[PDB]
Design a protein around this ligand. Structure first.
Ligand SMILES: COc1ccccc1NC(=O)CCCCC(=O)O
Ligand SMILES: COc1ccccc1NC(=O)CCCCC(=O)O
Ligand SMILES: COc1ccccc1NC(=O)CCCCC(=O)O
Ligand SMILES: COc1ccccc1NC(=O)CCCCC(=O)O
Lengths: 252, 300
């Protein structure tokens, strides 16, 4: 069924599963025309398909040519997502195919179910989790590959860098979701936190900086403070007066 | 005109014949139904006064044999049987008619209701949905499941309606996933009409039989099939223009006949609102839309 605030640890068992997020597939700018009407212009997008146990990210770049001459693009984008995920599954060896695919948006359920009819044993599920995978385009190296693409392309990343050498997949997923939620909430402040210190760098083969264990604790605290600070600004709430239980609930 | 005699009526029962219903008292001198119009299928149905559980009944056509009803005290129900001795049957019927012990089928002259509900229903197709080859008539009851229900359990006692499933490989061509899911025309025209039913009359006959089993028996599987066959047409962009016209007539008479107090259980809100207001054919069912809006505006 749905994947809620009861089945958290299922994400880190040994059954292969993928999250699919389609938020960034169809992306547009909106502008006035010479005659004073409004028009959209599509920009390159991506499908975010992530194995939460291993960190493997299958980033399918959606080039704007796929929309040329097509109608009802927001509907088509869901079916294109489902077509690409189905093609990905078919391209993987049998022992690498997922047993479950979890979609971040319920509107992806029917398109994916229909494209996966030939895989009756792969469960297609929604989730009650509010995962911030839309903020993937705030990761500089991911945004760069998407915007530079001149044709459809699949790019493979490990979104956890080398963290699984030191932490569990449960903790790595928690760290990723905290980082992405902070980037979604205040992108400039989050990037300042991640890059403020010149002495810590991002390896050529990584997405995130090379923090030590203790530095990651500090970074994570600063990200929680960012989220709490923005919550206070949004709702006109004095965050200093809040208790630890109130703060933990808001971050959750 | 033809006749279905009853040996006797040992238990109090509501007997329905087509869209009509009447009550027989325990051990009343009731001996059957006369003046049944030749040229249509008919259904004789029962609901026991002391146990409204199990509506049950029999579809039959008097052109196919001489049929009568006899109560079985072991199985506890009124059973249809065929009499092969024609002179005996005529003698029985004549005596009961002479003594005025049979109620009269009251087909009022202006009234085309039964024809309008059964235009496409044939006994030979009923006997393929309800499989019991040794009888010329077909038993249906409230609780019989459909083949499709039995997949999601005695096969010999099931309704073999054609399985309709919008998220099945039958309904969706590889490579045409979006097209075929959003526009059911392939599934309607190529798979169902050309492939399974062969023509729109057979499709309409099964749709009409499903509706009548839902209404007369309170059969859930029948109600699901009726709605699925409507939704398949309404969700197709390309349908033979006369077919939509004939469907509008079929549905109009079904909605007109439906008992108002059963509208909550026999009509699916989701399906009807989609068909009348969202589907490709939302503007193609003007007569059905008008009766639905005037008789059951709450459902919409
Ligand atoms: C297992 O991680 C999860 C699993 C499923 C859903 C969410 C999460 N994580 C979070 O929400 C991390 C932020 C709150 C944690 C923190 O501030 O350290
Ligand atoms: C924008 O604030 C909101 C918007 C939506 C929901 C809640 C809030 N916050 C509040 O109600 C805090 C009290 C507000 C006290 C004040 O008015 O200054
Ligand atoms: C014992 O009555 C019956 C016995 C057998 C069959 C039918 C009936 N019904 C009637 O005589 C009244 C029909 C009323 C319906 C209408 O007005 O359209
Ligand atoms: C099973 O007998 C039936 C036969 C014909 C029609 C309906 C039912 N049953 C139901 O609908 C039960 C589930 C939904 C109940 C409801 O809200 O109506």
């Amino acid at each position: 069924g749905a994947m809620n605030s009861s089945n958290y640890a299922e994400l880190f068992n040994n059954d292969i599963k993928l999250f699919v997020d389609d938020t960034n597939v169809y992306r547009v700018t909106v502008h006035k025309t010479f005659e004073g009407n409004v028009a959209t212009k599509a920009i390159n997008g991506c499908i975010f398909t992530l194995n939460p146990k291993t960190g493997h990210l299958f980033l399918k770049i959606i080039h704007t040519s796929v929309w040329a001459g097509q109608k009802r693009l927001s509907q088509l984008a869901k079916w294109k997502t489902a077509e690409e995920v189905s093609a990905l599954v078919r391209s993987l060896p049998k022992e690498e195919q997922p047993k479950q695919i979890i979609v971040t948006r319920k509107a992806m359920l029917d398109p994916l179910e229909v494209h996966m009819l030939d895989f009756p044993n792969i469960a297609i599920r929604p989730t009650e989790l509010r995962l911030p995978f839309s903020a993937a385009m705030s990761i500089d190296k991911l945004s760069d590959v998407v915007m530079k693409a001149t044709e459809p392309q699949m790019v493979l990343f490990n979104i956890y860098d080398d963290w699984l050498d030191r932490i569990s997949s449960y903790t790595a997923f928690s760290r990723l979701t905290l980082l992405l939620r902070a980037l979604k909430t205040n992108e400039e402040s989050a990037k300042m936190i991640l890059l403020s210190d010149p002495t810590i760098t991002i390896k050529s083969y990584h997405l995130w900086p090379s923090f030590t264990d203790e530095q990651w604790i500090t970074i994570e605290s600063q990200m929680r403070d960012l989220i709490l600070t923005e919550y206070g600004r949004k709702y006109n709430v004095n965050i200093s007066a809040l208790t630890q239980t109130e703060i933990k609930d808001i971050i959750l | 005109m033809n006749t279905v005699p009853f040996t006797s009526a040992p238990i109090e029962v509501t007997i329905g014949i087509d869209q009509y219903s009447f009550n027989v008292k325990e051990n009343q001198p009731f001996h059957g139904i006369k003046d049944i119009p030749i040229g249509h299928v008919h259904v004789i149905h029962f609901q026991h006064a002391d146990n409204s559980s199990m509506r049950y009944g029999y579809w039959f056509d008097c052109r196919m044999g001489n049929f009568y009803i006899q109560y079985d005290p072991k199985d506890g129900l009124y059973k249809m049987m065929e009499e092969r001795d024609g002179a005996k049957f005529e003698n029985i019927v004549h005596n009961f008619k002479e003594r005025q012990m049979m109620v009269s089928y009251p087909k009022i002259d202006e009234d085309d209701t039964w024809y309008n509900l059964t235009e496409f229903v044939q006994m030979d197709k009923i006997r393929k949905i309800v499989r019991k080859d040794e009888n010329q008539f077909s038993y249906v009851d409230s609780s019989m499941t459909t083949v499709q229900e039995n997949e999601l359990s005695d096969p010999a006692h099931s309704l073999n309606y054609t399985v309709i499933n919008f998220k099945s490989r039958e309904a969706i061509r590889p490579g045409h996933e979006m097209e075929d899911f959003l526009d059911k025309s392939y599934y309607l025209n190529t798979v169902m009409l050309q492939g399974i039913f062969k023509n729109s009359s057979n499709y309409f006959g099964e749709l009409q039989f499903a509706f009548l089993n839902a209404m007369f028996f309170g059969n859930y599987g029948s109600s699901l099939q009726w709605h699925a066959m409507i939704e398949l047409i309404c969700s197709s962009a390309t349908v033979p223009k006369h077919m939509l016209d004939k469907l509008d007539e079929i549905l109009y008479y079904q909605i007109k006949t439906l008992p108002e107090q059963y509208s909550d259980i026999l009509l699916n809100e989701r399906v009807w609102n989609i068909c009348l207001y969202s589907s490709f054919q939302k503007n193609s069912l003007h007569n059905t839309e008008k009766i639905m809006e005037n008789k059951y505006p709450e459902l919409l």
